[PDB]
Amino acid sequence: AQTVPYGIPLIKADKVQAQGFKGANVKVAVLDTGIQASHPDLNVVGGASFVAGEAYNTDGNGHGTHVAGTVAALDNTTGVLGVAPSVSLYAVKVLNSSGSGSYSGIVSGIEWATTNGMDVINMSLGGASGSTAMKQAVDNAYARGVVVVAAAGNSGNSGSTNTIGYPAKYDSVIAVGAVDSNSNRASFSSVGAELEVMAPGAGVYSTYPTNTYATLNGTXMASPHVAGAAALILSKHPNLSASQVRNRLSSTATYLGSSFYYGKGLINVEAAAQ
Numbered sequence: 001a002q003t004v005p006y007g008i009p010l011i012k013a014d015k016v017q018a019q020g021f022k023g024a025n026v027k028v029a030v031l032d033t034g035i036q037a038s039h040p041d042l043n044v045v046g047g048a049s050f051v052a053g054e055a056y057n058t059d060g061n062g063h064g065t066h067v068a069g070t071v072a073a074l075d076n077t078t079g080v081l082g083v084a085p086s087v088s089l090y091a092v093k094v095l096n097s098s099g100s101g102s103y104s105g106i107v108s109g110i111e112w113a114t115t116n117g118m119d120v121i122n123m124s125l126g127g128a129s130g131s132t133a134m135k136q137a138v139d140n141a142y143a144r145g146v147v148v149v150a151a152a153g154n155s156g157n158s159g160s161t162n163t164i165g166y167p168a169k170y171d172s173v174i175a176v177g178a179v180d181s182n183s184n185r186a187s188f189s190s191v192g193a194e195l196e197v198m199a200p201g202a203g204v205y206s207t208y209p210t211n212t213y214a215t216l217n218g219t220x221m222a223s224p225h226v227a228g229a230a231a232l233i234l235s236k237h238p239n240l241s242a243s244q245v246r247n248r249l250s251s252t253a254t255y256l257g258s259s260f261y262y263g264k265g266l267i268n269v270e271a272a273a274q
């Protein structure tokens with residue numbers, strides 16, 4: 001009765017989970033539209049909301065619940081299966097139900113996660129511009145040992161135009177692009193010198209508000225695969241620093257083409273967690 005989304009075997013997360021590593025006791029904060037904590041296939045440990053009028057454990061949009069399920073949907077006999085099903089999941093609401101948020105709200109979410117000892121921060125969000133405060137927040141989180149992952153953007157490519165959004169563009173953040181079930185680059189995936197790795201992003205089935213499951217497209221779907229991957233590497237090698245985990249993901253990636261379009265390639269967690 002439990003469906004395994006194609007992205008799990010494509011990045012070889014199933015090979016690592018089989019070895020017995022599932023992200024147990026790794027703290028992952030999902031900075032998004034919140035998470036439907038009551039969903040039967042998700043276990044939210046805690047969180048915070050920096051959005052006015054909405055608690056952190058409700059998701060009036062669906063995006064956050066979907067992103068969270070890709071990272072951590074519970075390994076059981078129902079729903080879907082996450083990349084790191086045993087992770088301690090934290091919902092940090094920085095985007096409202098319409099899917100938008102302020103720089104200050106996001107920055108607060110990053111500081112909260114840094115302050116509260118998160119091991120991995122997933123940001124399936126981005127803007128055309130950044131800000132000094134946002135740059136300072138991600139650099140600090142990274143310098144403090146947190147693996148920071150963000151969706152590269154859904155602006156495709158305009159010739160040689162760099163379309164990578166913020167915060168993925170900052171060098172302390174891993175910019176994740178998207179591929180489909182055939183390992184081909186999705187048309188919407190942003191391109192640029194900053195693109196770092198690729199992960200499943202087209203046709204991703206995951207948990208969705210009001211106890212159900214849905215399919216969405218976006219680099220937003222790709223990002224959690226990498227945040228989940230970092231969690232598996234950390235559960236297997238708890239001694240690694242944020243830099244080492246990051247370097248393992250990019251160095252062992254499967255080459256797919258030019259770095260402007262694919263970065264270093266598709267992540268291979270089995271190889272990265274060696």
Ligand code: NA
Pocket residue numbers: 002041073074075076077078079080081
């Ligand atoms: Na499940």
Ligand code: NA
Pocket residue numbers: 167168169170171172173174175194
């Ligand atoms: Na980056």
